[PDB]
Each structure stands twice: as C-alpha cells, then as structure tokens.
Amino acid sequence: GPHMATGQDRVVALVDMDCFFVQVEQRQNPHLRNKPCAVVQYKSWKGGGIIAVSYEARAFGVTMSMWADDAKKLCPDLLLAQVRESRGKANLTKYREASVEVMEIMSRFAVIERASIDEAYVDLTSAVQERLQKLQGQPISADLLPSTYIEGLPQTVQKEGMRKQGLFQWLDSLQIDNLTSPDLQLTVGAVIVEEMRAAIERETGFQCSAGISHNKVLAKLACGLNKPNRQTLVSHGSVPQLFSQMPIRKIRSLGGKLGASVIEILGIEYMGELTQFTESQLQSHFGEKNGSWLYAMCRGIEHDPVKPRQLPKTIGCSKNFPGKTALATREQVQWWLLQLAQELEERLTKDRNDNDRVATQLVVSIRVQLSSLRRCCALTRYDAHKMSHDAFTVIKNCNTSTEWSPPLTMLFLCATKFSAS
DNA sequence: ATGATGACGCT
DNA sequence: AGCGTCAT
Ligand SMILES: Nc1ncnc2c1ncn2[C@H]1C[C@H](O)[C@@H](COP(=O)(O)OP(=O)(O)OP(=O)(O)O)O1
Ligand SMILES: [Ca+2]
Ligand SMILES: [Ca+2]
After folding, report:
1. Which domains can be identified in chain A, with CATH numbers?
2. What's A155-202 look like in SS3?
3. Among A92, A234, A284, A418, which residue carries the largest CB count within 10 Å?
4. Is A119 a catalytic residue?
5. If DSSP codes are grouped into helix, strand and coil, which group holds residue A121?
6. A117 lines ligand 1 (CB under 6 A)
7. What's its catalytic activity?
8. A143, exposed or middle or buried, with CB in 10 Å at 0-12, 13-18, 19+?
9. Alpha-carbon Rg of chain A, whole angstroms?
10. Secondary structure letter of residue A270 according to DSSP
11. Which residues of A81-100 are buried (b: 16+ CB within 10 A; e: fewer)?
C-alpha cells in the first residue's frame, strides 16, 4: 504494498530521429532517398569515416565508424554524402540547423530536454492530463495509434499483423473510466507522440522513432525496440519479463565500466537479476548513489527529471591529428588553434544573436603523442585571434621542447558558463 | 586513423 | 578547478 512506490507518476517520451545525418542529406538530394547510403567525413583516408548509415545500407552490414572503402566491400552500390569541410575541418552546421528544426516542433507539444543533436526527452504528464479531460471518458481507437507497439504483447505471421494484435489486446483491457490509471496515461501519451511524430515528418520530412514509458531510462530503452519510423510503449507491468532477459549493458549509463563491474562482482547477466539484492548490498558494491539507483531501476523505477533545456550548455570545436599528422611545430599549433577559434567565434556570434546569451569561459584541451590536459581562461570577447592567442598561452608551458614535443594529437576549444544577455 | 562533439560525476 | 565516465 500500500505504501510501495511504483514509479508510475509521470509520462515520459524519448524521440530519436532515424539515421539522422543520412535523412538530412536525403532530404537535400532526392537521388539518395530510399537507397543504401551513408554519411562520411573526410575522404582521403580509406574513403572517409562513416558517421551515419541508412537502414537499407545496414542490411548489408554497414556500420558506424566503418571506413567507407571497407563499407564498399560489403555494399558495392553504397551511396555517400560527405560532411562539409571548412577551415580544414569537419563542419557540422547543416545537422545542427536541422536539429533546431525538429526541436522547435517538439517544443510546441511539451517541455523538452535536448539529449543530443537528434534526441529529446519529453515530459508529457501535463499534456496527458489535459487530453484526458478533453476526451471525456471516450475509449481510445486503435486508429489513433497507427505506428505504436505495446512491448510484451500479443501474449498472423507478418510484422504489422503482430503489431495490431498486441495493440488490440492492450486497448481491449484498458480501464478508460479511471483518469488516474498509469496504463491509460501512457496510452494517451502514445497518442500525443503519434501526433508529434506526424508533425515532425509533415513539417521537416524527417522520420523518427520514440519510446513512451514512465521515466527516461525506460523511454530510451523502449525507443530502441522497434526502429525505424515506429514507437514503442513500455508499461510498468511489462518490466519484469522485459528485464528478465535484458543484458545489463543495454540500460542507459550501464554500457561502460559500472555495468561491467555489476556483471563481474554480482555474477549476473540480466537487469532483472538485480532484484534479488538488498538496497544496502548494491550500495556496498557500487556506492550510495549508484546502489540506490540500481535498486530502483531494476524494478522499473527512476526519478531523473526531464530537464527544461532545449539549447546546448557548451559550444565546442575540436580536431584530431592522428599518426604522422600530429602537430610538431609551434606555427602549426598556432594555425590550427586559430582555425578552431574562427569556427568557434562564428558559432558563438550566431548563438548570442539567436539565444540572448554570452559564454564567459573558454576551456582549452589538448592531447600529446581522450584528454591529456584541460586548462580554462576567461572569454571576454568573441574574437578568434584573441581566443586562439589565449588558448596558446594557457597550454604553451607544456611544450617539452619548430618545435613542439611531444607532438599534439588533439586540439579542443570549448565555450562554457553562459550568462543571459 | 574513427571524428566531432556534449552532459555530468568525483575529489 | 581538472580529470574521468558515458553517451550520440
Ligand atoms: N560517434 C559519433 N561520431 C560522430 N557523429 C555521430 C556519432 N554518433 C552519432 N553521430 C551523429 C550521426 C547520427 O546521424 C546522429 C544520431 O546518432 P544516433 O542516434 O546514435 O544514430 P542515427 O540517428 O544515425 O541512427 P539510429 O536510427 O540508430 O538512431 O548523430
Ligand atoms: Ca538517431
Ligand atoms: Ca540519437
């Protein structure tokens, strides 16, 4: 249980653009539409590195991080679009601007948290309440959920047939008389997300997938279950079966070292197996915060808020200088810091005009033959020569010595600490 | 020769 | 403040 919290207090969605950079290039160049294609950056080394892959190309085994020359061995008719290059480096402006298109549409429906260039969390709890009162007590037609999967259902032999059967079982057992039913609330959430996804596609051309659940972690997991161009509802009730065979690494934030340590120390494989440990046990192995989080998460419960944040908190530029291209002379170091600073100035000035804010700190980070060393200085003027000069100053004293030893394999300039303006 | 980003936690 | 983790 009577006092046992069930993590069913919110409706949260995660919207994720399908193969996003590919869709941006396909909208622009119709010749690429409905074809195996990929987006690459740079071209000289092994045809360039693939950074996005259409679903038609994925069927050939083409993946992210693949060299284009290698992808071509799997998929000889693979089509390619390449990232713009400016000032000697990859320039991602086209994709950031396409991102803004989508985020602005989503923000018409609800408060969003920008999670990445192509993902946003959506807190739908309020929107759902409103739609529930407007719908009187009327049942929800399957026609309102034309691209929705209900995870765990059903419980003919074609994929769409399965989808509908599952949706039918779900709707035919919904308690539409109870405006406080979590399952009803999720369902209405899914209706709204259908509407949001239709509006994005109508107004931009871009397709996306989505997950609808009671928190961000379940929403994100949900989103990945049926892709592309589909959405998945994960109810509280679906969690025990879903987690019983769900590898721990699939849950957001457990994909790395912590997740590996959970597996090794507890000697388990699946998210569900976490339930047999006390909260104190989990905290003993993984710390107070992680332990509490795991104990609740493996039961489908998570409280991280959808933060009201549509804009990035930092604006950064970086370039790697791998192998022999590593920077070995002072003049080399200065010229690239300047290149980075010039892109940074451009993006910052745009940012200040669009969003009425100004960055106040400049963070400089380098690697010598992830980050070796980060140093910050004040950012008082949007001027690329001053920023590049300042960046040099705060890193110049780590030259072991043109000449620059040891060679620099990465330069990175990041503007941070925004104040309103 | 992945590269280019971006949020947040720890001390 | 500077570094590490985890992610797209
Ligand atoms: N490691 C990376 N380096 C550079 N760019 C990336 C990287 N990961 C993702 N991106 C860019 C390209 C993607 O189009 C976009 C969104 O990433 P992500 O959602 O992980 O894949 P995706 O949108 O291409 O495919 P999916 O349909 O699987 O989401 O961000
Ligand atoms: Ca995506
Ligand atoms: Ca994404």
Report:
1. 1-18+89-247 (3.30.70.270), 19-88 (3.40.1170.60), 248-305 (1.10.150.20), 306-421 (3.30.1490.100)
2. CCCCHHHHHHHHHHHHHCCCCCCCCCCHHHHHHHHHHHHHHHHHHHHH
3. A234
4. yes
5. strand
6. yes
7. DNA(n) + a 2'-deoxyribonucleoside 5'-triphosphate = DNA(n+1) + diphosphate
8. exposed
9. 24
10. B
11. bbbeeeeebbbbeebeebbe
Which bases along strand C come within 7 Å of a protein CB atom? 1-8
Identify the three-state secondary structure at position A222.
helix
Residue type, A327: L
Residue nearest to nucleotide C6 (CA to C1'): A253
Query: How far is C-alpha A119 from the chain's CA centre?
Result: 4
Which residue type is seen at A295?
Answer: Y
What single-letter amino acid sits at A35? K
* Structure-token pair, residue A92: 């991602």
- Closest C-alpha residue for ligand 1 atom 9: A51
Q: Reading across the β-sheet that carries A12-17, which strands appear in turn?
A: A112-116, A119-123, A12-17, A208-213, A231-233, A148-150
CA angle A122, A124, A126 (to 5 degrees): 140
DSSP A214: S
Instruction: Tell me the technique behind this structure.
Output: X-ray
CA gap A11, A219 in Å, rounded: 9
Strand B, nucleotides covered by protein (CB < 7 Å): 1-10
- Please tell me the total number of residues recorded for chain A in this structure: 421
The tokens describing A406, both together, are 């040891």
Nearest to A50 by CA among A76, A20, A24, A81: A81
Resolution (in Å) of the shown entry? 2.0
Q: How far apart are CA A215 and CA A291, in angstroms?
A: 18
Burial of A280 (0-12, 13-18, 19+ CB in 10 A): exposed
The answer to whether some atom of strand C lies closer than 7 Å to the beta carbon of A255 is yes
Tokens of A258: 């912590």
Q: Using the Cα atoms of residue A378, residue A383, residue A389 and residue A395 in order, give the sign of their dihedral.
A: positive
DSSP string over A75-103:
-TT-EEEE--EETTEE--HHHHHHHHHHH
Residue A67, burial from CB neighbour count under 10 angstroms (0-12, 13-18, 19+) = middle
Q: Say which nucleotide is closest to residue A371, CA to C1' distance.
A: C3
The 8-class DSSP code of residue A381 comes to S
- Gap between the Cα atoms of A319 and A303, Å rounded: 37
